[PDB]
Amino acid sequence: DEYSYYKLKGASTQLEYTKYMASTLQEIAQRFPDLQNTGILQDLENYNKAWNDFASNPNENATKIALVKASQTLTESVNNTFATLDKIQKKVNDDIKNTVDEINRIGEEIATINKQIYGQEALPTEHANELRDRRDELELTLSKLVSAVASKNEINQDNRLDTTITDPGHQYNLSIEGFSIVDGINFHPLKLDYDDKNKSYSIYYETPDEKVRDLTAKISGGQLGAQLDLRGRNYSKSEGKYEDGIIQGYMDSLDTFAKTMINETNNLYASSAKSSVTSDYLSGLKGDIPLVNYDRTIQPGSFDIVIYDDKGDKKLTKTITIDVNTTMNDIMRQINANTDDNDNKNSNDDVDDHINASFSYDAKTGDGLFQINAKSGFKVAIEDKGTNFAGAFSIGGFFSGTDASDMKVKDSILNDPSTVRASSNGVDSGNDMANKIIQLQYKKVNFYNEDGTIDNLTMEEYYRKLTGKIASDGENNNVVNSSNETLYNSVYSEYQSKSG
C-alpha cells in the first residue's frame, strides 16, 4: 500500500506535467489557428492585394494611401501576434514563482510536522497518525508540482531503546535534484532570483554558507517541469530572451517570419531609385564588425549602387562586394574609391560621383547610421545580389525593424505616402519594381531560424508551418497526456484498493 502510493506520486507528476502542457499549448493554438485566411494571413492577403491595386494605378495617390494603410495593419498585426506569445510566456514565468512558493510552504510544513513526530516528547497515537497522514498528503500534493525524492526509514515501536534520542535526518529526507528541502526536521527552501527587469525567475538552492546551486536547467516533473519547458530555462541578459523553451521557439519563428518579410520586401523596394536613402539606426554597429557577424541574414555576395537622373535613365553602377570579413568601414572604402573602369554611353561621359555616402557611429547612443544622398538632379537605388545588405539595414526600404515586435512601415513612408514609388528608376510612372513585390508572395525565400536551420518557403508557407508546428505539439502532448490519465486512474484504483 506504500508502494502503490509511490506509484501514485509518480503518476501525478507525469499527468500534471502533460495537463499544464495541454492547457498552455491549447491556448497558444487558439491564438494561432492553423487555418488559411485568418489573422496575419488575412492581413497579409489584404496587403498583397494593396500592392496589386497600387501596381495597377501607380500614379493615383489614393492607392499609395491604401497601400500604406494595409501595410501598417499588417505590421501591427505582427506586433500584436508577438505580444500575445510574450504575454503567455510572462504568464508562465509568473506561475513558476507561484509554484516555487507553494513547494516551499509544503516543505516547511513537512519539516514542522517532523519536529513533532521525531520530537523528544511522546505524542498520543492518534495525533501521531494524523500528522503522518497530513505529511503523506503534502508529499502527494508536492508531486503535482515537481519531481521530488522522499527517502524514508520508518520507526519500530518495539521500544527496547528508551530513553534514547531520535536521529530525524535519517528518518525522513525530501530532496529536489539531490538537494535536501527537508532534512529530518530542518527546512531548506528553494530560492528565486532575477537579474534584469523581465524578472526571468531562476530557481536556486542556497547553502547555509550562502553558496548558490542553480536548478533552473535541472528541475523537472509536474507543473514546474512543464512551466520550465514551456517558458525556457537558460535566460540571456544580453539578448533579453530565452535560449530554449517551447514558447520561446514560437516567438523566434515569429521573429524570423518578420525578419525575412522585412529583408525580402526591402531588398526589392531598395531597387526603386530615391533622392536619398537612410538606414534605420543600427544598434551596436561599429565600423569594424564584420557584417555577416552583425546580422546572420547578411550573406556574402555583392550589390550595385545605381544612379539615375531625374528623368529616369540609368547613368551609373558601382558594384560593392561583401565577404565574411567585410565591415561597414570596408563598405565605405569601396564606396569612396574612384577607378570605375566601365564603358557606358557615350563618348566617355560618366564622371566623378553623384552621391554623398556616409556612415557614422554615435558613441553616446551605440547606434550606427548609413546614408546615401544623391546630388540634386539624381536618384540612387540599390540592387542586391544575395547579400540582404540594404534589406536588413532598411537602406531605402519599405519596412523598418528587426523582429516581430519592432516591424513597421518606414517612418518617411507613413508620414508621406506620396513618396512611395512603383518603378526601378524612381519616376512616378512605371511599375516594374512593385510587380516584383507582388510576385514575392509566391517566391521561395530563406528563413534563418534560431535553431540553425534555413527554411526555404514562401511567407505564407512559413507562417502555416509555425501554426502547424503548434498544433502538432499540442496533439503529440495530447497522446502522452491521454495515456498518463489511464495510467493515473489505474494506479489510483490500485492505491484505493490496497488501502481502507
Residue numbers in the entry: 70 to 569
Can you list sentences taken from the study reporting this PDB entry?
Here, we solved the three-dimensional structure of a major fragment of FlgK from C. jejuni, strain ATCC 700819/NCTC 11168, using X-ray crystallography. To crystallize FlgK (67 kDa) of C. jejuni strain ATCC 700819/NCTC 11168, we removed 68 and 28 amino acid residues from the N- and C- termini, respectively. The remaining 58 kD fragment, named FlgKcj58, has 511 amino acids (See Methods for detailed experimental procedures). The structure of FlgKcj58, in which 11 C-terminal residues were not resolved, comprises the fragment [Asp69-Gly568]. FlgKcj58 can be described as composed of two domains. There is a central domain, D1, which could be divided into two sub domains, D1a and D1b, and a more compact domain D2, consisting mostly of β-strands. However, the cell-distal half of the protein has diverged, developing a different 3D structure.
A special junction to assure a smooth connectivity is needed to link the hook and the filament, which have different structural and functional characteristics. In this junction, the first segment, composed of the FlgK complex, is in contact with the hook, while the second segment, made by the FlgL complex, connects to the filament. The junctions made by FlgK and FlgL play important roles in bridging the hook to the filament. Once the hook is completed, FlgK starts appearing at the top of the hook to form the first junction, followed by FlgL that builds up at the top of the ring made of FlgK.
